Amino acid sequence: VEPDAGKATWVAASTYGTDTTTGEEVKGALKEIHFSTYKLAAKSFITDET
Amino acid sequence: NFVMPRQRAVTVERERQAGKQRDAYYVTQRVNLQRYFANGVVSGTYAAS
């Protein structure tokens, strides 16, 4: 599962190349989600004489 | 005598990658001027006061 993005900072209107002073967006980590399957059981019996 | 030697004429070249919202032009040649013997140029003075 990925996360949202993002915020980008707008320029200072005078800095048109060398250098542009825009945001550095950090490559969003893909987050694992893991699922665990638990078990249960029941037993029963009767005897053929009862 | 006074001859100027050259081995590349004026050339013109340009980029774009790895720029950043810019295109840019370069011009580069190779040349010099040489006094062959000793003399044959004279000027001044024509000093100051």
Coordinates of all heavy atoms in Angstrom, one line a residue:
Chain A
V1 N 0.8 -1.2 0.0 CA 0.0 0.0 0.0 C 0.9 1.3 0.0 O 1.7 1.5 0.9 CB -1.0 0.0 1.1 CG1 -0.4 -0.2 2.5 CG2 -1.9 1.2 1.1
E2 N 0.7 2.1 -1.0 CA 1.4 3.4 -1.1 C 0.9 4.5 -0.2 O -0.1 4.3 0.4 CB 1.5 3.8 -2.6 CG 0.2 4.0 -3.3 CD 0.3 4.5 -4.7 OE1 1.5 4.8 -5.2 OE2 -0.7 4.6 -5.4
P3 N 1.5 5.7 0.0 CA 0.9 6.7 0.8 C 0.5 7.9 -0.2 O 1.1 7.9 -1.3 CB 2.0 7.2 1.7 CG 3.3 7.0 0.9 CD 3.0 5.8 -0.1
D4 N -0.3 8.8 0.2 CA -0.5 10.1 -0.4 C 0.8 10.8 -0.9 O 1.9 10.6 -0.4 CB -1.3 11.1 0.4 CG -2.8 10.7 0.6 OD1 -3.0 9.7 1.3 OD2 -3.7 11.4 0.0
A5 N 0.6 11.8 -1.8 CA 1.6 12.8 -2.0 C 0.8 14.1 -2.4 O -0.3 14.0 -2.9 CB 2.5 12.4 -3.2
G6 N 1.3 15.3 -2.2 CA 2.5 15.7 -1.4 C 2.4 17.1 -1.2 O 1.3 17.6 -1.0
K7 N 3.5 17.8 -1.1 CA 3.5 19.3 -1.1 C 4.7 19.7 -1.9 O 5.8 19.2 -1.8 CB 3.7 19.9 0.3 CG 2.7 19.6 1.4 CD 1.3 20.1 1.1 CE 0.2 19.7 2.2 NZ -1.1 20.2 1.7
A8 N 4.4 20.6 -2.9 CA 5.5 21.2 -3.7 C 5.6 22.7 -3.5 O 4.6 23.4 -3.6 CB 5.3 20.9 -5.2
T9 N 6.8 23.2 -3.1 CA 7.0 24.6 -2.8 C 7.2 25.4 -4.1 O 8.1 25.2 -4.9 CB 8.1 24.9 -1.9 OG1 9.3 24.3 -2.3 CG2 7.8 24.4 -0.5
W10 N 6.3 26.4 -4.4 CA 6.4 27.3 -5.5 C 7.6 28.2 -5.4 O 8.1 28.6 -4.3 CB 5.1 28.2 -5.5 CG 3.8 27.5 -5.8 CD1 3.1 26.7 -4.9 CD2 3.0 27.7 -7.0 NE1 1.9 26.3 -5.6 CE2 1.8 26.9 -6.8 CE3 3.3 28.3 -8.2 CZ2 0.9 26.8 -7.8 CZ3 2.3 28.2 -9.2 CH2 1.1 27.5 -9.0
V11 N 8.1 28.6 -6.6 CA 9.3 29.4 -6.8 C 9.2 30.9 -6.2 O 8.1 31.4 -5.9 CB 9.7 29.5 -8.3 CG1 9.9 28.0 -8.8 CG2 8.6 30.2 -9.1
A12 N 10.3 31.6 -6.1 CA 10.4 32.9 -5.7 C 10.2 34.0 -6.8 O 10.6 35.1 -6.6 CB 11.7 33.1 -4.9
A13 N 9.7 33.5 -8.0 CA 9.3 34.4 -9.1 C 10.5 35.0 -9.9 O 10.3 35.6 -11.0 CB 8.2 35.4 -8.8
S14 N 11.7 35.0 -9.3 CA 12.9 35.6 -9.9 C 14.0 34.5 -10.3 O 14.9 34.8 -11.0 CB 13.6 36.6 -8.9 OG 12.6 37.6 -8.6
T15 N 13.9 33.3 -9.7 CA 14.9 32.3 -9.8 C 14.7 31.3 -10.9 O 14.7 30.1 -10.8 CB 15.1 31.6 -8.5 OG1 13.8 31.2 -7.9 CG2 15.7 32.5 -7.5
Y16 N 14.6 31.8 -12.2 CA 14.3 31.0 -13.3 C 15.5 30.3 -13.9 O 16.0 30.6 -15.0 CB 13.5 31.8 -14.4 CG 12.1 32.2 -13.8 CD1 11.4 33.1 -14.6 CD2 11.6 31.8 -12.6 CE1 10.1 33.6 -14.2 CE2 10.3 32.3 -12.2 CZ 9.6 33.2 -13.0 OH 8.3 33.6 -12.6
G17 N 16.0 29.2 -13.2 CA 17.0 28.3 -13.6 C 18.4 28.7 -13.1 O 18.7 29.9 -13.1
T18 N 19.2 27.7 -12.6 CA 20.4 27.9 -11.8 C 20.1 28.8 -10.5 O 20.7 29.9 -10.4 CB 21.7 28.3 -12.4 OG1 21.6 29.6 -13.1 CG2 22.1 27.3 -13.5
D19 N 19.3 28.4 -9.6 CA 18.5 27.2 -9.6 C 17.1 27.4 -9.1 O 16.7 28.5 -8.6 CB 19.3 26.0 -8.8 CG 19.2 24.8 -9.7 OD1 18.0 24.3 -9.9 OD2 20.2 24.3 -10.2
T20 N 16.2 26.4 -9.4 CA 14.8 26.7 -9.4 C 14.1 26.7 -8.1 O 13.0 27.2 -8.0 CB 14.0 25.6 -10.3 OG1 14.2 24.3 -9.8 CG2 14.6 25.6 -11.7
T21 N 14.8 26.2 -7.0 CA 14.3 26.3 -5.6 C 12.9 25.7 -5.4 O 12.1 26.3 -4.6 CB 14.5 27.7 -4.9 OG1 13.7 28.7 -5.5 CG2 16.0 28.1 -5.0
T22 N 12.6 24.6 -6.1 CA 11.4 23.9 -5.9 C 11.6 22.7 -5.0 O 12.8 22.3 -4.7 CB 10.7 23.4 -7.2 OG1 9.4 22.8 -7.0 CG2 11.6 22.3 -7.9
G23 N 10.6 22.2 -4.4 CA 10.6 21.0 -3.5 C 11.4 19.8 -3.9 O 11.5 19.5 -5.0
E24 N 11.9 19.1 -2.9 CA 12.5 17.8 -3.1 C 11.4 16.8 -2.5 O 11.2 16.7 -1.3 CB 13.8 17.7 -2.3 CG 14.8 16.6 -2.8 CD 15.4 17.0 -4.1 OE1 16.0 18.2 -4.2 OE2 15.2 16.3 -5.1
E25 N 10.8 16.0 -3.4 CA 9.8 15.1 -3.0 C 10.4 13.7 -2.9 O 11.1 13.2 -3.7 CB 8.5 15.1 -4.0 CG 8.4 14.1 -5.1 CD 7.8 12.7 -4.8 OE1 7.4 12.5 -3.6 OE2 7.6 11.9 -5.7
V26 N 10.3 13.2 -1.6 CA 11.0 11.9 -1.3 C 10.1 10.8 -1.7 O 8.9 10.7 -1.5 CB 11.3 11.9 0.2 CG1 12.4 13.0 0.5 CG2 10.1 12.0 1.1
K27 N 10.8 9.8 -2.5 CA 10.1 8.7 -3.1 C 9.3 7.8 -2.1 O 9.8 7.0 -1.4 CB 11.1 7.8 -3.8 CG 10.6 6.4 -4.4 CD 9.5 6.5 -5.4 CE 8.8 5.2 -5.7 NZ 7.9 4.8 -4.7
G28 N 8.0 8.0 -2.1 CA 7.0 7.3 -1.2 C 7.2 5.9 -1.1 O 7.1 5.1 -2.0
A29 N 7.5 5.4 0.2 CA 7.7 4.0 0.5 C 6.4 3.2 0.3 O 5.4 3.6 0.8 CB 8.3 3.8 1.9
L30 N 6.5 2.0 -0.3 CA 5.4 1.1 -0.4 C 5.4 0.3 0.9 O 6.4 -0.3 1.3 CB 5.5 0.2 -1.6 CG 5.1 0.8 -3.0 CD1 6.2 1.7 -3.6 CD2 4.8 -0.3 -4.1
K31 N 4.3 0.4 1.6 CA 4.2 -0.1 3.0 C 3.6 -1.5 2.8 O 2.5 -1.7 2.2 CB 3.3 0.7 3.9 CG 3.7 2.2 3.9 CD 2.7 3.1 4.7 CE 1.2 3.1 4.2 NZ 1.3 3.5 2.7
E32 N 4.2 -2.6 3.4 CA 3.6 -3.9 3.5 C 2.4 -3.9 4.4 O 2.4 -3.2 5.5 CB 4.6 -5.0 3.7 CG 5.3 -5.0 5.1 CD 6.1 -6.3 5.3 OE1 5.4 -7.4 5.1 OE2 7.3 -6.3 5.5
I33 N 1.4 -4.8 4.1 CA 0.3 -5.2 5.0 C 0.3 -6.7 5.0 O 0.2 -7.3 3.9 CB -1.0 -4.6 4.6 CG1 -1.1 -3.1 4.6 CG2 -2.2 -5.2 5.5 CD1 -1.0 -2.5 6.0
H34 N 0.5 -7.4 6.1 CA 0.5 -8.8 6.2 C -0.6 -9.4 7.0 O -1.1 -8.8 8.0 CB 1.9 -9.3 6.8 CG 2.1 -8.9 8.3 ND1 1.5 -9.5 9.3 CD2 3.0 -8.0 8.8 CE1 1.9 -8.9 10.5 NE2 2.9 -8.0 10.2
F35 N -1.2 -10.5 6.6 CA -2.4 -11.1 7.2 C -2.1 -12.5 7.8 O -1.4 -13.3 7.2 CB -3.5 -11.4 6.1 CG -4.1 -10.1 5.7 CD1 -3.6 -9.3 4.7 CD2 -5.3 -9.7 6.4 CE1 -4.2 -8.1 4.3 CE2 -5.9 -8.5 6.0 CZ -5.4 -7.7 5.0
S36 N -2.6 -12.8 9.0 CA -2.3 -14.0 9.8 C -3.5 -14.8 10.1 O -4.4 -14.4 10.7 CB -1.7 -13.7 11.2 OG -0.5 -13.0 11.1
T37 N -3.5 -16.1 9.6 CA -4.8 -17.0 9.7 C -4.7 -18.0 10.9 O -4.1 -19.0 10.8 CB -5.3 -17.6 8.4 OG1 -4.3 -18.6 7.9 CG2 -5.5 -16.6 7.4
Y38 N -5.4 -17.6 12.0 CA -5.5 -18.5 13.2 C -6.5 -19.6 13.0 O -7.4 -19.6 12.2 CB -5.9 -17.7 14.4 CG -4.8 -16.7 14.8 CD1 -4.7 -15.4 14.3 CD2 -3.8 -17.2 15.8 CE1 -3.7 -14.6 14.7 CE2 -2.8 -16.3 16.2 CZ -2.7 -15.0 15.7 OH -1.7 -14.2 16.1
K39 N -6.3 -20.7 13.8 CA -7.0 -21.9 13.7 C -7.8 -22.2 15.0 O -7.3 -21.9 16.1 CB -6.1 -23.2 13.4 CG -5.0 -23.5 14.4 CD -4.2 -24.8 14.2 CE -3.3 -25.1 15.3 NZ -2.5 -26.3 15.1
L40 N -8.9 -22.9 14.9 CA -9.6 -23.5 16.1 C -10.1 -24.8 15.7 O -10.2 -25.2 14.5 CB -10.7 -22.6 16.7 CG -12.0 -22.4 15.9 CD1 -13.0 -21.7 16.8 CD2 -11.8 -21.6 14.6
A41 N -10.5 -25.6 16.7 CA -11.1 -26.9 16.4 C -11.9 -27.3 17.6 O -11.7 -26.9 18.7 CB -10.0 -28.0 16.2
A42 N -12.9 -28.2 17.4 CA -13.7 -28.8 18.5 C -13.8 -30.3 18.2 O -13.7 -30.7 17.1 CB -15.1 -28.1 18.5
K43 N -14.1 -31.1 19.2 CA -14.3 -32.5 19.1 C -15.5 -32.9 19.8 O -15.9 -32.3 20.7 CB -13.0 -33.3 19.5 CG -12.7 -33.4 21.0 CD -11.3 -34.0 21.3 CE -11.1 -34.5 22.7 NZ -11.5 -33.5 23.7
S44 N -16.0 -34.1 19.5 CA -17.2 -34.6 20.1 C -17.2 -36.1 19.9 O -16.5 -36.6 19.0 CB -18.5 -34.1 19.6 OG -18.7 -34.3 18.2
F45 N -17.9 -36.9 20.8 CA -17.9 -38.3 20.7 C -19.1 -38.8 21.5 O -19.6 -38.1 22.4 CB -16.6 -39.0 21.2 CG -16.2 -38.6 22.6 CD1 -16.5 -39.5 23.7 CD2 -15.5 -37.4 22.8 CE1 -16.2 -39.1 25.0 CE2 -15.2 -37.1 24.2 CZ -15.6 -37.9 25.2
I46 N -19.6 -40.0 21.1 CA -20.6 -40.7 21.8 C -20.1 -42.2 21.7 O -19.3 -42.4 20.9 CB -22.0 -40.5 21.2 CG1 -22.6 -39.1 21.3 CG2 -23.1 -41.5 21.8 CD1 -22.9 -38.6 22.7
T47 N -20.5 -43.1 22.5 CA -20.2 -44.5 22.4 C -21.3 -45.3 21.8 O -22.5 -44.9 22.0 CB -19.7 -45.2 23.7 OG1 -20.6 -45.1 24.8 CG2 -18.4 -44.5 24.1
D48 N -21.1 -46.4 21.0 CA -22.2 -47.0 20.3 C -23.2 -47.7 21.3 O -24.4 -47.9 20.9 CB -21.7 -47.9 19.1 CG -20.2 -47.9 18.7 OD1 -19.8 -46.9 18.0 OD2 -19.5 -48.9 18.9
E49 N -22.8 -48.0 22.5 CA -23.6 -48.6 23.6 C -24.4 -47.6 24.4 O -25.1 -48.0 25.4 CB -22.5 -49.2 24.6 CG -21.6 -48.2 25.2 CD -20.6 -48.6 26.3 OE1 -20.6 -49.7 26.8 OE2 -19.7 -47.7 26.5
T50 N -24.4 -46.3 24.0 CA -25.1 -45.2 24.8 C -26.0 -44.4 23.9 O -26.3 -43.2 24.0 CB -24.2 -44.2 25.6 OG1 -23.1 -43.7 24.9 CG2 -23.7 -44.9 26.8
Chain B
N1 N 55.3 37.8 -42.3 CA 55.4 38.1 -40.9 C 54.2 38.9 -40.5 O 53.7 39.8 -41.2 CB 56.8 38.8 -40.6 CG 57.2 40.0 -41.2 OD1 56.5 40.9 -41.7 ND2 58.6 40.2 -41.2
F2 N 53.7 38.6 -39.3 CA 52.5 39.2 -38.6 C 51.3 38.2 -38.6 O 50.4 38.3 -37.8 CB 52.1 40.6 -38.8 CG 53.2 41.6 -38.2 CD1 54.2 42.1 -39.0 CD2 53.1 41.9 -36.8 CE1 55.2 42.9 -38.4 CE2 54.1 42.7 -36.3 CZ 55.1 43.2 -37.0
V3 N 51.3 37.2 -39.5 CA 50.5 36.0 -39.6 C 49.8 35.5 -38.4 O 50.5 35.3 -37.3 CB 51.2 35.0 -40.4 CG1 52.5 34.5 -39.6 CG2 50.4 33.7 -40.8
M4 N 48.5 35.1 -38.4 CA 47.8 34.5 -37.3 C 47.5 33.0 -37.6 O 46.7 32.7 -38.5 CB 46.6 35.4 -36.9 CG 45.8 36.1 -38.0 SD 44.7 35.1 -39.1 CE 43.4 34.9 -37.8
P5 N 48.0 32.1 -36.8 CA 47.8 30.7 -37.1 C 46.5 30.2 -36.4 O 46.3 30.6 -35.2 CB 49.0 30.0 -36.6 CG 49.5 30.9 -35.4 CD 49.2 32.2 -36.0
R6 N 45.8 29.2 -37.0 CA 44.6 28.7 -36.4 C 44.3 27.3 -36.8 O 44.6 26.9 -37.9 CB 43.3 29.6 -36.7 CG 42.9 29.6 -38.2 CD 41.8 28.6 -38.6 NE 41.4 29.0 -40.0 CZ 40.5 28.4 -40.8 NH1 40.1 27.2 -40.5 NH2 40.0 29.0 -41.8
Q7 N 43.8 26.4 -35.9 CA 43.5 25.0 -36.3 C 42.1 24.6 -36.0 O 41.7 23.5 -36.2 CB 44.5 24.0 -35.6 CG 44.4 24.0 -34.1 CD 45.5 22.9 -33.6 OE1 46.7 23.2 -33.7 NE2 45.0 21.8 -33.1
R8 N 41.2 25.6 -35.5 CA 39.8 25.4 -35.5 C 39.2 26.7 -35.7 O 39.6 27.7 -35.0 CB 39.2 24.7 -34.2 CG 37.7 24.3 -34.4 CD 37.0 23.6 -33.2 NE 37.1 24.5 -32.0 CZ 38.0 24.4 -31.0 NH1 39.0 23.6 -31.0 NH2 37.9 25.2 -29.9
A9 N 38.3 26.9 -36.7 CA 37.6 28.1 -36.9 C 36.5 28.2 -35.9 O 36.3 27.4 -35.0 CB 36.9 28.0 -38.4
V10 N 35.7 29.3 -35.9 CA 34.5 29.4 -35.1 C 33.5 28.3 -35.4 O 33.1 28.1 -36.5 CB 33.9 30.8 -35.1 CG1 33.5 31.2 -36.6 CG2 32.8 31.0 -34.1
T11 N 33.0 27.7 -34.3 CA 32.0 26.6 -34.3 C 30.9 27.0 -33.3 O 31.2 27.9 -32.5 CB 32.5 25.2 -34.0 OG1 33.3 25.2 -32.8 CG2 33.5 24.8 -35.1
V12 N 29.7 26.5 -33.4 CA 28.7 26.8 -32.5 C 27.9 25.6 -32.1 O 27.5 24.8 -33.0 CB 27.8 27.9 -33.0 CG1 27.1 27.6 -34.3 CG2 26.7 28.3 -31.9
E13 N 27.7 25.3 -30.8 CA 27.1 24.1 -30.2 C 26.1 24.5 -29.1 O 26.1 25.6 -28.7 CB 28.3 23.2 -29.8 CG 29.3 23.9 -28.7 CD 30.8 23.7 -28.9 OE1 31.2 22.5 -29.0 OE2 31.5 24.7 -29.0
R14 N 25.3 23.5 -28.7 CA 24.3 23.8 -27.7 C 23.8 22.5 -27.0 O 24.1 21.4 -27.4 CB 23.0 24.5 -28.3 CG 22.0 23.7 -29.1 CD 20.7 24.3 -29.4 NE 19.8 23.3 -30.0 CZ 19.2 22.3 -29.3 NH1 19.0 22.4 -28.0 NH2 18.8 21.2 -29.9
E15 N 23.2 22.7 -25.8 CA 22.8 21.6 -24.9 C 21.3 21.2 -24.9 O 20.7 20.9 -25.9 CB 23.4 21.9 -23.5 CG 23.0 23.3 -22.9 CD 22.5 23.2 -21.5 OE1 21.6 22.4 -21.2 OE2 23.0 24.0 -20.6
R16 N 20.7 21.2 -23.6 CA 19.4 21.0 -23.2 C 19.3 20.0 -22.1 O 18.6 20.1 -21.1 CB 18.3 20.7 -24.3 CG 16.9 20.6 -23.8 CD 16.4 21.8 -23.0 NE 14.9 21.6 -22.6 CZ 14.1 22.6 -22.4 NH1 14.3 23.8 -22.8 NH2 13.0 22.4 -21.7
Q17 N 20.2 18.9 -22.2 CA 20.3 17.9 -21.2 C 21.7 17.8 -20.7 O 22.7 17.7 -21.5 CB 19.7 16.5 -21.6 CG 20.4 15.9 -22.8 CD 19.8 14.5 -23.1 OE1 18.9 14.0 -22.5 NE2 20.4 13.8 -24.1
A18 N 22.1 17.9 -19.4 CA 21.2 18.0 -18.2 C 21.0 19.4 -17.8 O 21.5 19.8 -16.7 CB 21.8 17.1 -17.1
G19 N 20.2 20.2 -18.5 CA 19.9 21.6 -18.2 C 18.9 21.7 -17.0 O 19.0 21.1 -16.0
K20 N 17.9 22.6 -17.2 CA 16.8 22.9 -16.3 C 16.2 24.2 -16.7 O 16.5 25.3 -16.2 CB 17.2 22.9 -14.8 CG 18.4 23.7 -14.4 CD 18.8 23.6 -12.9 CE 19.0 22.2 -12.3 NZ 20.1 21.6 -13.0
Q21 N 15.2 24.1 -17.6 CA 14.4 25.2 -18.1 C 15.2 26.3 -18.7 O 15.1 27.5 -18.4 CB 13.4 25.7 -17.0 CG 12.4 24.6 -16.7 CD 12.2 24.4 -15.2 OE1 13.1 24.4 -14.4 NE2 10.9 24.4 -14.7
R22 N 16.2 25.8 -19.6 CA 17.2 26.7 -20.2 C 17.6 26.0 -21.5 O 17.6 24.8 -21.6 CB 18.3 26.8 -19.1 CG 19.5 27.7 -19.5 CD 20.3 28.2 -18.3 NE 19.4 29.2 -17.6 CZ 19.7 29.7 -16.4 NH1 20.9 29.5 -15.8 NH2 18.8 30.5 -15.7
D23 N 18.1 26.8 -22.5 CA 18.9 26.3 -23.6 C 20.0 27.2 -23.6 O 20.0 28.4 -23.2 CB 18.0 26.3 -24.9 CG 18.7 25.6 -26.1 OD1 19.0 24.4 -26.1 OD2 19.0 26.3 -27.1
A24 N 21.2 26.8 -24.1 CA 22.5 27.5 -23.9 C 23.4 27.2 -25.0 O 23.5 26.1 -25.5 CB 23.1 27.1 -22.5
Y25 N 24.1 28.2 -25.5 CA 24.9 28.2 -26.7 C 26.4 28.4 -26.3 O 26.7 29.3 -25.5 CB 24.6 29.3 -27.7 CG 23.2 29.0 -28.3 CD1 22.1 29.4 -27.6 CD2 23.1 28.2 -29.4 CE1 20.8 28.9 -28.0 CE2 21.9 27.8 -29.9 CZ 20.7 28.1 -29.1 OH 19.5 27.5 -29.5
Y26 N 27.3 27.6 -26.9 CA 28.7 27.7 -26.7 C 29.3 28.0 -28.0 O 28.9 27.5 -29.1 CB 29.3 26.4 -26.1 CG 28.7 26.1 -24.7 CD1 27.6 25.3 -24.6 CD2 29.4 26.6 -23.5 CE1 27.0 25.1 -23.3 CE2 28.8 26.3 -22.3 CZ 27.6 25.5 -22.2 OH 27.1 25.3 -20.9
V27 N 30.4 28.8 -28.1 CA 31.2 29.1 -29.2 C 32.7 29.0 -28.9 O 33.2 29.7 -28.0 CB 30.9 30.4 -29.9 CG1 29.6 30.4 -30.7 CG2 30.9 31.6 -28.9
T28 N 33.5 28.1 -29.5 CA 34.9 28.0 -29.1 C 35.8 27.7 -30.3 O 35.6 26.8 -31.1 CB 35.2 26.9 -28.0 OG1 35.4 25.6 -28.4 CG2 34.1 26.8 -27.0
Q29 N 36.9 28.5 -30.5 CA 37.8 28.3 -31.6 C 39.3 28.1 -31.1 O 39.4 27.7 -29.9 CB 37.8 29.5 -32.6 CG 38.0 30.9 -32.1 CD 38.0 31.9 -33.3 OE1 38.2 31.5 -34.4 NE2 37.8 33.2 -33.0
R30 N 40.3 28.1 -31.9 CA 41.7 28.1 -31.5 C 42.6 28.9 -32.4 O 42.7 28.5 -33.6 CB 42.2 26.6 -31.3 CG 43.7 26.5 -30.8 CD 44.2 25.1 -30.6 NE 43.8 24.5 -29.3 CZ 44.3 24.9 -28.1 NH1 45.4 25.7 -28.0 NH2 43.9 24.3 -27.0
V31 N 43.3 29.9 -31.9 CA 44.0 30.9 -32.7 C 45.0 31.7 -31.9 O 45.1 31.6 -30.6 CB 43.0 31.9 -33.3 CG1 42.2 32.7 -32.2 CG2 43.6 32.9 -34.4
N32 N 46.0 32.4 -32.5 CA 46.9 33.3 -31.8 C 47.5 34.3 -32.9 O 47.2 34.2 -34.0 CB 48.1 32.5 -31.1 CG 49.0 33.4 -30.3 OD1 48.6 34.4 -29.7 ND2 50.3 32.9 -30.2
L33 N 48.3 35.4 -32.5 CA 48.9 36.3 -33.3 C 50.4 36.2 -33.0 O 50.8 36.1 -31.9 CB 48.4 37.7 -33.1 CG 48.5 38.8 -34.2 CD1 47.6 40.0 -33.9 CD2 49.9 39.3 -34.4
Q34 N 51.3 36.2 -34.0 CA 52.8 36.0 -33.8 C 53.7 37.0 -34.5 O 53.7 37.2 -35.7 CB 53.2 34.6 -34.1 CG 53.1 33.6 -32.9 CD 54.2 33.8 -31.9 OE1 54.2 34.5 -30.9 NE2 55.4 33.2 -32.2
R35 N 54.6 37.6 -33.7 CA 55.7 38.5 -34.2 C 56.9 37.5 -34.7 O 57.6 37.0 -33.8 CB 56.2 39.4 -33.0 CG 57.3 40.4 -33.4 CD 57.4 41.5 -32.3 NE 57.8 40.9 -31.0 CZ 59.1 40.6 -30.6 NH1 60.1 40.9 -31.3 NH2 59.3 40.2 -29.4
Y36 N 57.0 37.3 -36.0 CA 57.9 36.3 -36.6 C 59.4 36.6 -36.4 O 60.1 35.7 -36.0 CB 57.5 36.3 -38.1 CG 58.2 35.2 -38.9 CD1 57.9 33.9 -38.8 CD2 59.3 35.6 -39.7 CE1 58.5 32.9 -39.6 CE2 60.0 34.6 -40.5 CZ 59.6 33.3 -40.4 OH 60.2 32.3 -41.2
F37 N 59.8 37.8 -36.8 CA 61.3 38.1 -36.8 C 61.6 38.8 -35.5 O 61.7 38.2 -34.4 CB 61.6 38.9 -38.1 CG 63.1 39.1 -38.3 CD1 63.8 38.0 -38.9 CD2 63.7 40.3 -38.1 CE1 65.2 38.2 -39.2 CE2 65.1 40.4 -38.3 CZ 65.8 39.4 -38.9
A38 N 61.7 40.2 -35.6 CA 61.9 41.0 -34.4 C 61.0 42.2 -34.4 O 60.4 42.6 -33.4 CB 63.3 41.4 -34.2
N39 N 60.8 42.8 -35.6 CA 60.3 44.2 -35.7 C 59.5 44.3 -37.0 O 59.1 43.4 -37.7 CB 61.5 45.2 -35.7 CG 62.4 45.1 -36.8 OD1 63.1 44.1 -37.0 ND2 62.5 46.1 -37.7
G40 N 59.0 45.6 -37.3 CA 58.2 45.9 -38.4 C 56.9 46.4 -38.0 O 56.0 46.6 -38.8
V41 N 56.7 46.8 -36.7 CA 55.6 47.5 -36.2 C 56.2 48.7 -35.4 O 57.1 48.5 -34.7 CB 54.7 46.6 -35.3 CG1 55.5 45.9 -34.2 CG2 53.5 47.4 -34.7
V42 N 55.6 49.9 -35.6 CA 56.0 51.1 -34.8 C 54.8 51.9 -34.5 O 53.9 52.1 -35.3 CB 57.0 52.0 -35.5 CG1 58.4 51.3 -35.5 CG2 56.6 52.3 -37.0
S43 N 54.8 52.4 -33.2 CA 53.7 53.3 -32.8 C 54.2 54.3 -31.7 O 55.0 53.9 -30.8 CB 52.4 52.6 -32.3 OG 52.6 51.6 -31.3
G44 N 53.7 55.5 -31.7 CA 54.0 56.5 -30.7 C 55.4 56.9 -30.3 O 56.4 56.4 -31.0
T45 N 55.7 57.7 -29.3 CA 54.7 58.4 -28.4 C 54.6 59.9 -28.8 O 55.6 60.5 -29.2 CB 55.2 58.2 -26.9 OG1 56.4 58.8 -26.7 CG2 55.3 56.7 -26.6
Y46 N 53.5 60.6 -28.7 CA 52.2 60.2 -28.1 C 52.2 59.7 -26.7 O 51.9 58.5 -26.4 CB 51.3 59.4 -29.1 CG 49.9 59.2 -28.7 CD1 49.0 60.2 -28.7 CD2 49.5 58.0 -28.1 CE1 47.7 60.1 -28.2 CE2 48.3 57.8 -27.5 CZ 47.4 58.9 -27.5 OH 46.2 58.7 -26.7
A47 N 52.6 60.6 -25.8 CA 52.7 60.2 -24.4 C 51.6 60.6 -23.5 O 50.5 60.2 -23.6 CB 54.1 60.8 -23.9
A48 N 51.9 61.5 -22.5 CA 51.0 62.1 -21.6 C 51.6 63.4 -21.2 O 52.7 63.8 -21.7 CB 50.8 61.2 -20.3
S49 N 50.9 64.3 -20.4 CA 51.4 65.6 -20.1 C 50.6 66.0 -18.9 O 50.9 67.2 -18.4 CB 51.2 66.6 -21.2 OG 51.6 67.9 -20.8

